[PDB]
Amino acid sequence: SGAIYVGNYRVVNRHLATHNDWANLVWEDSSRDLLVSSTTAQGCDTIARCDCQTGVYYCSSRRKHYPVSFSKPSLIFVEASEYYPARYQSHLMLAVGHSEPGDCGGILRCQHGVVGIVSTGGNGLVGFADVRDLLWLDEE
């Protein structure tokens, strides 16, 4: 689990969104595994606006924050899971590291702010859904 809180927006993994998130939906994309909903209170997170390929992510299944090198956002084949059939997921970045399904939502951050959230894993790899291209998260 986990979310990003920026301005009056809440960013979560689409597969973990609640009834309230869908009722207050701003934008969602199944191919990215992302959903953004509106909030009443102001958030305190800052979204990175950069092309960084190094950062730190939180891994709940190890209670640890790991420094990682990660790939640029791309279209990557993701195996079938409990929440989606086998498909290509877009805007996905991979790193060598540990990930289990319940780790989804863990933040990846660089010196500029939040880069994305954990979304995939397996085979000693961890994948993150990028949010740095969602420029509208910085306004209204």
Is 130 near ligand A1BSG (CB under 6 A)?
A: no
Question: Which of the residues 24 through 63 are near ligand A1BSG (CB under 6 A)?
Answer: 33
**Start-to-end Cα distance in the chain:** 26
Selecting among 21, 59, 103, 104, the annotated active-site residue is 104
Tell me the β-bridge partners of 27.
36
Q: Which does 98 bind (CB under 5 to 8 A by kind): ligand A1BSG, Zn ion, none?
A: none
Active site residue 59: no
Binding mask 76-115 for ligand A1BSG (x = CB under 6 A): --x--xxxx----x---------xxx-xx-----------
Active site residue 98: no
Closest to ligand A1BSG by CB, 33 vs 130, is: 33
Q: What angle do CA 13, 96, 133 make, to 5 degrees?
A: 45
Kindly state the DSSP code that residue 21 receives in the 8-state scheme: H
Strand-pair category, 87-96 with 125-130: antiparallel
Q: Is 52 marked within a binding site?
A: yes
Single out the residue of 103, 108, 81 nearest to residue 92, CA to CA.
Answer: 108
Active site residue 104: yes
Tell me the β-bridge partners of 102.
none
Is 52 near Zn ion (CB under 5 A)?
A: yes
Closest to ligand A1BSG by CB, 53 vs 60, is: 60
Tell me the β-bridge partners of 11.
4, 36
Active site residues: 15, 33, 104
